[PDB]
Amino acid sequence: KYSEPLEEHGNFLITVPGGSDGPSGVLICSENYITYKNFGDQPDIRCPIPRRRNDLDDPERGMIFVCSATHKTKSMFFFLAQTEQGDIFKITLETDEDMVTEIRLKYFDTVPVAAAMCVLKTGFLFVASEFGNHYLYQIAHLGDDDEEPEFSSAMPLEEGDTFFFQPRPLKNLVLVDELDSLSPILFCQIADLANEDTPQLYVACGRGPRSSLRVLRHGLE
Amino acid sequence: RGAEYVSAREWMRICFELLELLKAHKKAIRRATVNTFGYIAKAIGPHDVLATLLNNLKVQERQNRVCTTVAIAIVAETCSPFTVLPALMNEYRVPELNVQNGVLKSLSFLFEYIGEMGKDYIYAVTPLLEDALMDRDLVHRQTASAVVQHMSLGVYGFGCEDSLNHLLNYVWPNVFETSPHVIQAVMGALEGLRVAIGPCRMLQYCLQGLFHPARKVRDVYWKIYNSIYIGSQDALIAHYPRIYNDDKNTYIRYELDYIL
Amino acid sequence: LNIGLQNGVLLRTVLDPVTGDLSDTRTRYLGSRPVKLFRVRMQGQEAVLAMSSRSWLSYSYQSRFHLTPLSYETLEFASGFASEQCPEGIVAISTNTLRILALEKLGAVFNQVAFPLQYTPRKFVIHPESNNLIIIETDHNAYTEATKAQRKQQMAEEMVEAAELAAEMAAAFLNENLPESIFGAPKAGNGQWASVIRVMNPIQGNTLDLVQLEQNEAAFSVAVCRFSNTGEDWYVLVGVAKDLILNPRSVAGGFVYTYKLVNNGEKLEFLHKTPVEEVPAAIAPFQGRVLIGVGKLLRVYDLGKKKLLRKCENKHIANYISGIQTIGHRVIVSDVQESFIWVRYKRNENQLIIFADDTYPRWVTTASLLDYDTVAGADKFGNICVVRLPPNTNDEVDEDRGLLNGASQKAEVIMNYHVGETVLSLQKTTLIPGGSESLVYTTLSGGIGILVPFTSHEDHDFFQHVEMHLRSEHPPLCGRDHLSFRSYYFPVKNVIDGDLCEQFNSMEPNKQKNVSEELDRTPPEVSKKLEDIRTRYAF
Amino acid sequence: MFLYNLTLQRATGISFAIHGNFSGTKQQEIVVSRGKILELLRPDPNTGKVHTLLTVEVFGVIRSLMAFRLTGGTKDYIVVGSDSGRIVILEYQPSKNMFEKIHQETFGKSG
Amino acid sequence: MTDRYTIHSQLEHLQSKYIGTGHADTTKWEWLVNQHRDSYCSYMGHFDLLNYFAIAENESKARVRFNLMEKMLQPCGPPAD
Amino acid sequence: AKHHPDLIFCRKQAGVAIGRLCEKCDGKCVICDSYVRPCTLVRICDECNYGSYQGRCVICGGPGVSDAYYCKECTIQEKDRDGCPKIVNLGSSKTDLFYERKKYG
Amino acid sequence: SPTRRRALDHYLTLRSSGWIPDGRGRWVKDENVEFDSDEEEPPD
Amino acid sequence: NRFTVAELKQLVARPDVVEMHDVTAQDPKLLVHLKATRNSVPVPRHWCFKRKYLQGKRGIEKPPFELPDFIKRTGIQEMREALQEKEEQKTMKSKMREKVRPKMGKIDIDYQKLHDAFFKWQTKPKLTIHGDLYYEGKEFETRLKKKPGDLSDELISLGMPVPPPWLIAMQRYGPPPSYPNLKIPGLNSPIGTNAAEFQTKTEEEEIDRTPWGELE
Amino acid sequence: DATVYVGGLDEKVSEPLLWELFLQAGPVVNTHMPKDRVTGQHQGYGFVEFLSEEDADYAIKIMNMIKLYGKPIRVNKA
Ligand SMILES: [Zn+2]
Ligand SMILES: [Zn+2]
Ligand SMILES: [Zn+2]
């Protein structure tokens, strides 16, 4: 049916819940932007992604979202989308009758970079890290208090520069469980370095800061 | 179901009579006839049956000989191939063309029928086939290629790749033949060999002639390449050669060159 | 019925509830002293604890029996325990002590401990005397510590240059530290490389020494060796690339850093830094000297006082060298895509001569020598091969012809197997005391497997028939063919997939009975033979 | 040289995760794809610990994963796209503790 | 002559169906663009090649997949005519 | 068939219809035309079982009497994945036979 | 004699370090091989 | 517009493979690059020959096929030879008369012998490694060409204790010009010092030769 | 010089042996040692084509080294 050019290249899409509940459209995540689009008379709505304030990165690098998850209550709905740096944002759509008018975007937390997130119905969040250990968080509070600035596509913004936020330790999530993963085993050596008779496995794994040397033995802890 | 109701001489002479049933025009009569030869050989033994069938290959008309060939394979399968192998391989030395094409034809059917069980006799019949693939008659080469196709797919997964690679060295110069029957038997053999010795070997054979100066060598080579590409497009990612960068285009796949 | 004996073997025997007729006894050998059995409670279930030289707990997990040994010292006696502090535990008396134990995680095969590093670990080596570890870590797109501090100071200057209160903010900006393992690492750009040498105690986990390198110098190889001319004095060689870009590839050069190991392996003392013209990707100790492959060049380096010294470099390896192994005077070089090359070093000519290689292109990631003639290797694409050298070959080659644009002698491939996931580590070892050897591999995805050789034909025929039945009876769950899966790039050769075979015990009982008819065995006997090979090699 | 392959420690990295009512009840599970392995994980609400219910090796490369409900349906099906050239629809059977293939439809070559 | 033209129609039929079969007049550029694009698809498909590339460059996998998808347009530079 | 170079397969995207074979064609493989070792069931595309044609022979087109299979060798080579294997044109041999008998008879 | 075998092995080691025996009882540095500047002659 | 062979040969990394007609290629750089890549086998040589493949006068006199040895151990060839040597003597009357009154148990080899031929005495033949393509003259030109410093047992004709008789003159007349690097004892090779053979002894002592993972 | 003429031989000597005889000096690329058909025996004179000039120049000297069945052998250019 419909075919419409985009301004910049998106990398994935999010299904906006529709029908009786919410408007039916698609959220397009692209480099430095999140865009709501729908077919019909609805104009496209773009929100820049907040960057970290006083960031040590190379300034040329853009920012994308790596994974998302939708939480649909019977009441309302929001999206949790994580950026490359591990920052999870809440995304909420504001509908003025039939169409949506702005996207609202609020810093939720910072978690290791994930391949998938799953908001379970019983107020948990399951983050499967792309490398290293996986985590199961419990959602204490949705991000609705505690005087934290909330960015928006309607907020009028000057030509070049963007929004900024300040990251912080955990507020909305509490770590409940952690699942050990050996991924990625970068190097290994099977040796007896601890003078008990069975050899142990000395393995090097993990990416960047979360990397570690692990000593594996055969038996229950 | 009832072979004890008749004497063995009766099954032998009734067996002789069945060779006239192979001249029938209806095909169902012919395939029922071939089956009956295997059932009879279970009662009077494969040698009495097999001598009769091997004598029938001197006949001129092709419909008789093709069916006799199928019946030799039928018995070979039902009474295991070590019984009928020696005599069939001995018959390849008879100085008559139809007999030699006939033995090759029944080996083709035999390897098609026994399947995985044919890893037990591939070393036996490898020198026979390499004798046939060196032969001056083109037909001798097309029937040997059919044998290679069917033997190739049977031993897939069983580590018989040295025989098959040896036979590829004989099959491969026949790619410049132009006769269509021989040309499609060769292509069938190569498509069987791709699944038994791998896409890498088959690409290593094609490589030098894909950009050869003559269109003759080139299009034959390109239509082997396409068959490898269709059947195994994903496995070839690891097997392509390294092409260097020229002045304006880059051709190195730099990701694979990554070192951890 | 569980029985224990003086020998140290544990016998678990069927006992019929209504009749009382013991059926099948699968013995297992655990420990070296008499074994004592005590009933305990785990997961609201009635497990058994058998204590020998090392304790061994037999329990059922996911409706499947397990036997794994407690990684803890020997105990004289034990029994069950329950209380508010610990709901399900063990009271154990070792001699002259009493203790309460809780098994937090069950159903596992390995327990682990983890020691944090800063960047991704590329390689490590074990110092033989000290038992320490020397680890090199490297990251692309990264800042080292010092570059991060300068960059931050530049930013704090910039906050003042923007605008009187601002310096107060910049003070807080210099002060606050977000923990990098939970807030990410700042990303620097293409060509930016942070790297570190670290000397580490394997038991305790503490960093004994730390060396930080320059901002675009990236470590790729490490060795610890004794140069025989200088005497008994350990040296650490670290190969470093300078200014490396990945797409498209370019490098400004390389260095090899030499350190000495002083204080019984506590400390590195910088000795010299010697420059090479391409990245030194493999360093290997070799008969009192060292082999260094710089790019496509294979060179032998002798320790000199001002730098390392070059002797007899070879220049016929096709592409980039990625790994070097030695046995005797034979050298096995892993090309990045030209597979294995066998090179012989002859002393009294002082030259390195290629005498054999392989007939396939292979993207080699690792290698390990199985014997004097065999090499096991692994690819980036996820498959393991075993290449042997044919019995006639001599390495008495004196330096034109060649076969097929390569060496005149070719090595035979005798095993192919597609694991499914990229293997980065092969090592030939024994895993359990009183086991046999095996070839252990660890994949990138986090898996660990073994490749164990059959000792008889009767075993080999049994396991091959079990595999061929199960390929048709119990086909893979996503519509793939098993013989086609394991033959992803090269046809499968000489391997029986035991992951498929041990799915016998997951089939339905009519199907287990139907398969086991043609093996002429009852399904307990098939499960026992599947479990015996795992038992006598592994865990 | 005949070798036998065994897996001591299965893969632990995670490629895909889908969450659903796979067991068919109130409880929610996660179906994770570990590349070559398909696992069923059920996290406890009160305790908070994740439990592995099922782990089956599929001998393929799982390339995409989704969860699927029929209209007015309680249980969810798992739809797996792989390199097999076919699409498989699976249902978890809790009484048996195994995935059950419901549909398998073939459209293409493998790899 | 006519056999040349029938070979030509057959091979363009193939090439439309399976993208990336050649014929007798495939240029270097065409063959290499095909095997670049097939490589990219293969990298996206296999999970551990993509892990390896995401470790060797210090990038996340989503960034890696997105860059590979960007390279699919002109993988080997502009067409050589 | 493999014996007739001018015959042409449908090759559209196959569906849930099972292809069948008439008494004459019973027991043979649709692709390579062999009599042995049947491995997989043949599926035909929607158009080819439209209407009256529902249930006719795949290979020739006569009243179908049993299910059609691919053989093992066509499965291993993945010839079973190319499409609908229904033959869509009679060809020269079938037509010639008709006119020849009709001339005589 | 074992001592003669050991002497021969030492001769081999001198053959490895790049020394040429062209000098009848003496050795010549080879130009191809990198040596440190300090050393003037091979150790005995 | 096109390269001559000299520019092409210098432009290759490896100039031994370039032929007369490679310059006529539509992309000659890639062709000579592919011809010099490892493990690829060359185009069959008769692509340019006017005579058809294997249709040559030498091929007329090819002898009959010979059975392998483990099959001749069965005695099939002598039995079937005798059989067909009787059957050329019979007339059509006699052949058609033993087709109504057959003769059982004539040409029977016991099953155990036939099974042993196939499941006990089978030997792998001589095989050829990949890239060894057959061409028409191949099985006659398979004699090849043995290097100086390596002698055959038969070259017994010399009957000399073990150095070569000719050498007592090669030191006189000089080192032959044809071989630049050849080394022979007494001229430029040890019968200096002779520690070269000791190296091989010491290394041969060092090696373990126990193949891993074999059958017990 | 690539070829040499070789006289004065005994028929027990063979072309394969002859190739090994002169490859002791340097490899004989093309061997020619007539077999006479009529009485099935050799007159004993030979022609040798080499790789290049190198084989030819040595050729005459190679004659002195040669001694078949207690007898000498003629080698000269051609
Ligand atoms: Zn029909
Ligand atoms: Zn078929
Ligand atoms: Zn159709």
Side-chain angles (χ1 to χ4, degrees), chain F residues 10-12 44-45 47-48 84 86:
Chain F
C10 174
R11 298 306 189 193
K12 295 184 184 178
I44 62 175
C45 85
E47 304 184 1
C48 286
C84 175
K86 187 85 194 291

Side-chain angles (χ1 to χ4, degrees), chain A residues 20-84:
Chain A
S20 71
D21 300 329
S24 181
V26 69
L27 282 169
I28 305 168
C29 300
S30 68
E31 195 182 7
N32 304 313
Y33 285 99
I34 174 72
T35 299
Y36 181 77
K37 284 176 73 77
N38 194 356
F39 61 92
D41 286 329
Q42 176 139 207
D44 305 336
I45 290 168
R46 294 177 70 190
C47 180
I49 301 164
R51 299 298 294 268
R52 290 213 267 246
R53 197 187 304 119
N54 298 319
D55 204 1
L56 281 82
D57 283 327
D58 194 11
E60 294 177 356
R61 294 180 67 94
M63 184 59 65
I64 61 170
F65 285 108
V66 301
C67 71
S68 77
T70 177
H71 188 199
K72 179 160 68 182
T73 330
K74 193 180 185 295
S75 59
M76 52 87 71
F77 62 92
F78 56 92
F79 304 99
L80 289 175
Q82 188 176 10
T83 66
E84 279 173 351

Side-chain angles (χ1 to χ4, degrees), chain C residues 334-352:
Chain C
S334 296
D335 193 347
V336 74
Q337 171 196 10
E338 245 15 59
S339 186
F340 308 110
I341 318 295
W342 278 262
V343 178
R344 194 257 180 99
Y345 180 61
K346 45 169 72 177
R347 294 176 71 187
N348 53 353
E349 280 86 2
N350 194 24
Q351 54 196 358
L352 293 164

Side-chain angles (χ1 to χ4, degrees), chain B residues 230-247:
Chain B
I230 283 155
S232 97
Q233 187 251 267
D234 194 17
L236 288 178
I237 300 303
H239 298 157
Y240 285 122
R242 179 188 298 263
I243 314 296
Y244 287 118
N245 299 325
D246 56 354
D247 52 353

Side-chain angles (χ1 to χ4, degrees), chain A residues 52 57 184 190 211 213 217, chain C residues 111 115 119 183 187 427 444:
Chain A
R52 290 213 267 246
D57 283 327
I190 300 171
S211 54
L213 191 95
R217 293 173 177 87
Chain C
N111 51 352
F115 296 145
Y119 309 100
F183 284 90
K187 284 191 177 177
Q427 181 185 357
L444 203 64

